[PDB]
Design a protein around this ligand. Structure first.
Ligand SMILES: Cc1cn([C@H]2C[C@H](OP(=O)(O)O)[C@@H](COP(=O)(O)O)O2)c(=O)[nH]c1=O
Ligand SMILES: [Ca+2]
Length: 136
């Protein structure tokens, strides 16, 4: 069973990457199961909805009273040293919030870390059906 642990915001980087203080050390976290449009890499450049996704996440984590991280059951870091988790702002999952708004797509689904896969896929279908942002 998964469990939530407290963390403290340091800085929001983009739609799906945030820096937090976790168990007293600064770490970069990458949200599990989603992909927000790129705003940094020279390849593909600044994708559409990139800025918007960034703005969404920033606002959500910066306005929260409490931030929590919840690791899945498999690896806890990616090849770049980033923590892989579901992040909550006042008990609301940022990962899901993004999908529900059409600011991210369900992606990077690894069999070892996919506990909330179905939950996110349901939210994505709803955003598609409402033709929001990315799906417009
Ligand atoms: C979400 C996630 C991404 N990644 C890796 C795959 C991609 O690698 P490559 O960069 O080598 O393509 C990259 C996607 O993250 P970004 O969307 O931040 O770029 O991070 C994982 O390894 N596991 C994960 O759970
Ligand atoms: Ca991304």
């Amino acid at each position: 069973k998964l469990h939530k642990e407290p963390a403290t915001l340091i800085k929001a980087i983009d739609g799906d990457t945030v820096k937090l203080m976790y168990k007293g050390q600064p770490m970069t976290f990458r949200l599990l199961l989603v992909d927000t449009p790129e705003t940094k890499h020279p390849k593909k450049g600044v994708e559409k909805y990139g800025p918007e996704a960034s703005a969404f996440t920033k606002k959500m984590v910066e306005n929260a009273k409490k931030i929590e991280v919840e690791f899945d059951k498999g690896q806890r870091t990616d090849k770049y040293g980033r923590g892989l988790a579901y992040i909550y702002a006042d008990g609301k999952m940022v990962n899901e919030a993004l999908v529900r708004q059409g600011l991210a797509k369900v992606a990077y689904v690894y069999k070892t870390n996919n506990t909330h896969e179905q939950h996110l896929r349901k939210s994505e279908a709803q955003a598609k059906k409402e033709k929001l942002n990315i799906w417009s």
